[PDB]
Amino acid sequence: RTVARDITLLECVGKGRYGEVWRGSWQGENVAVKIFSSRDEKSWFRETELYNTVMLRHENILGFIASDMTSSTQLWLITHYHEMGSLYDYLQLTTLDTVSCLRIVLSIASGLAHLHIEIFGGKPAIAHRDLKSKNILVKKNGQCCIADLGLAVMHRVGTKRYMAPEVLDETIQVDCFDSYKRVDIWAFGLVLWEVARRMVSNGIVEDYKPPFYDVVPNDPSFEDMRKVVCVDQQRPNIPNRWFSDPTLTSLAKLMKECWYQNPSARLTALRIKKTLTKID
Amino acid sequence: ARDITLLECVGKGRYGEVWRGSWQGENVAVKIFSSRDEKSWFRETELYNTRHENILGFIASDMTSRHSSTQLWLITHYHEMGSLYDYLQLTTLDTVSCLRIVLSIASGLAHLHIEIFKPAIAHRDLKSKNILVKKNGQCCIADLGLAVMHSNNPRVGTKRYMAPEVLDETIQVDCFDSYKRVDIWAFGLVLWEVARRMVSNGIVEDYKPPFYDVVPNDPSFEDMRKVVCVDQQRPNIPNRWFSDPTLTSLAKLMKECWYQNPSARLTALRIKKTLTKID
Ligand SMILES: COc1cc(-c2cncc(-c3ccc(C4CCN(C)CC4)cc3)c2C)cc(OC)c1OC
Ligand SMILES: COc1cc(-c2cncc(-c3ccc(C4CCN(C)CC4)cc3)c2C)cc(OC)c1OC
Ligand SMILES: COc1cc(-c2cncc(-c3ccc(C4CCN(C)CC4)cc3)c2C)cc(OC)c1OC
Numbered sequence A: 001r002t003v004a005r006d007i008t009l010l011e012c013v014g015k016g017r018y019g020e021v022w023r024g025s026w027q028g029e030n031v032a033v034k035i036f037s038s039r040d041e042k043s044w045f046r047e048t049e050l051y052n053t054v055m056l057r058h059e060n061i062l063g064f065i066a067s068d069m070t071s072s073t074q075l076w077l078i079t080h081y082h083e084m085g086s087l088y089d090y091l092q093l094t095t096l097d098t099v100s101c102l103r104i105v106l107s108i109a110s111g112l113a114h115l116h117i118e119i120f121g122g123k124p125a126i127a128h129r130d131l132k133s134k135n136i137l138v139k140k141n142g143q144c145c146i147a148d149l150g151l152a153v154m155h156r157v158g159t160k161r162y163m164a165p166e167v168l169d170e171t172i173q174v175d176c177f178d179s180y181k182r183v184d185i186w187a188f189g190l191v192l193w194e195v196a197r198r199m200v201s202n203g204i205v206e207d208y209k210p211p212f213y214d215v216v217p218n219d220p221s222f223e224d225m226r227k228v229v230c231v232d233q234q235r236p237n238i239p240n241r242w243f244s245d246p247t248l249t250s251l252a253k254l255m256k257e258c259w260y261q262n263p264s265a266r267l268t269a270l271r272i273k274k275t276l277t278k279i280d
Numbered sequence B: 001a002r003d004i005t006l007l008e009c010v011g012k013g014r015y016g017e018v019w020r021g022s023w024q025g026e027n028v029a030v031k032i033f034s035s036r037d038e039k040s041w042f043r044e045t046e047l048y049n050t051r052h053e054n055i056l057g058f059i060a061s062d063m064t065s066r067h068s069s070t071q072l073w074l075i076t077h078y079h080e081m082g083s084l085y086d087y088l089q090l091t092t093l094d095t096v097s098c099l100r101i102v103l104s105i106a107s108g109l110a111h112l113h114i115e116i117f118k119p120a121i122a123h124r125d126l127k128s129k130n131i132l133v134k135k136n137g138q139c140c141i142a143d144l145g146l147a148v149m150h151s152n153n154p155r156v157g158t159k160r161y162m163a164p165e166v167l168d169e170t171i172q173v174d175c176f177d178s179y180k181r182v183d184i185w186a187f188g189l190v191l192w193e194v195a196r197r198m199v200s201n202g203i204v205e206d207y208k209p210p211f212y213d214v215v216p217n218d219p220s221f222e223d224m225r226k227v228v229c230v231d232q233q234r235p236n237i238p239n240r241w242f243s244d245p246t247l248t249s250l251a252k253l254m255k256e257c258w259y260q261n262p263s264a265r266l267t268a269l270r271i272k273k274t275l276t277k278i279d
């Protein structure tokens, strides 16, 4: 039999330190091709090792197609393609209503709970370790999927803006898998804040801002972040207008329970999921 | 043109399957791994991320999945003439062919073993089936699925070729030098398999695998341990070899691969040097 490995690279939809993401075509089908830089080659190996250990298949987890190494060395990760792009891009120039806001955040919680839970007979527990709005893609059915398991760990390293206090102050209990779950929940709390801001209530909505936009520069340093999160113990602002909306009022409670300095006190993904199904 | 056509199965076993294929009008080899061997696929892909005339040449490595099923591919150059194990079955050697083969294996292994500033690599599964014969009469080493790097769970490769310290599980698991030493033991056995097939004074031995005479067919780990560790057996040197200067030199080399004390064994580089001195 023939094995069609020909993947046409049609347009570049991302270019960073990680390398490049291309919209590609394989047998008429849209695929996403991440071409890794030498800088980021370790992320190809860790993600490939993860998918070689457990083939994750979930609505809210970016769909794996292939890992390819070709002879210098070329490292490609091939996934399902989501034309609407990242949540980060989508929130820039889209507002939400109650239904579309809750659909996004419950799909993210569902993806994250699925990563975090050990399923027997099954999958190991997985912590993502780089959860942010850029690593969440928007699907046409209004649900989201979590992308980029390049830093993931199965039972410091992530984007500085989203790092939990225990990462920034190096108190993270590195011997405890639960520590990495708790770091994901912190970041989930920030993403929730970024989404809730874009949900309209009483004709009011906040403009898109990244977490801590008002207290750190662009490309905050480790020290910038540690002073805000660890020393001053600052948390993102909850606007007054949220307290006139029952949904944003319940989401405010939820995000604050993801932001405790004490990691053990934070909600679990499974608890967040239960709470989000009782909202509306 | 990334397209690959699978033309015919050249091998089938617990490791999976290997296929002669076409790719850009060139012959290639395509290994599709068994589910059992997924960790080897990943380890080999890591190794190949680190090129040499006597190492199986890498083209590509792929993990593919839809739904619950995964395929693991390794694409390499194709060697028409097959494995050394195959080649030795119904070919005899003269002095020049015999040394060319063993000097090329020693070169490949020296290249694996030596850090370039490429890490140091111990193969851990050296055997005639994991060596391929090139048209120029030289060989290349294949199968880095168990290979270890230096700038992991059980102690196991192919039973018949396992070093005494592997069979009695006294091997220094944390010492990289231990893994090089296991390669030299197995290389000694490959030297013996090859030398048996070199004609001297109108005499040649039939192809036999290491320990053919002293263990049951398809020997167990206990079987190998009994003969290597308890009975202290080594492959027999046919007396006819001692009439030949080359086979006399090779018999001396392979005994310096077979000391029970791993620290006593020659280095790949010393074997390369000695084989370069022999004519
Ligand atoms: C190697 O590389 C790539 C390959 C492919 C690709 C193209 N056609 C067919 C396949 C295929 C899948 C499964 C079987 C068999 C094997 C197991 N048996 C039990 C029955 C089923 C055969 C063939 C693949 C894997 C796509 C790629 O990209 C999307 C590849 O990467 C560039
Ligand atoms: C986070 O990480 C990964 C993401 C993806 C991925 C999958 N679908 C779609 C996209 C995408 C497409 C298009 C835009 C923009 C382009 C400009 N304008 C027209 C709006 C749209 C953004 C994003 C991406 C980036 C693939 C990956 O790997 C192959 C990723 O790495 C795991
Ligand atoms: C990697 O990606 C894609 C691959 C393919 C594809 C192409 N040929 C053959 C296959 C295949 C066939 C059969 C088995 C199984 C059947 C059950 N049992 C008997 C074991 C063997 C597995 C695999 C696939 C999955 C199609 C895709 O999309 C249409 C892919 O997505 C881009």
Ligand SMILES: COc1cc(-c2cncc(-c3ccc(C4CCN(C)CC4)cc3)c2C)cc(OC)c1OC
Residues within 6 Å of the ligand: B010, B011, B018, B029, B030, B031, B056, B074, B075, B076, B077, B078, B079, B080, B081, B082, B083, B086, B129, B130, B131, B132, B142, B143, B144
């Ligand atoms: C050991 O290891 C790997 C080997 C190879 C490989 C490369 N060239 C040629 C071959 C070959 C061709 C043909 C025969 C013939 C011999 C006589 N006849 C009765 C049976 C068939 C044998 C062997 C192979 C097996 C590829 C691999 O992966 C791509 C290997 O895995 C690392």
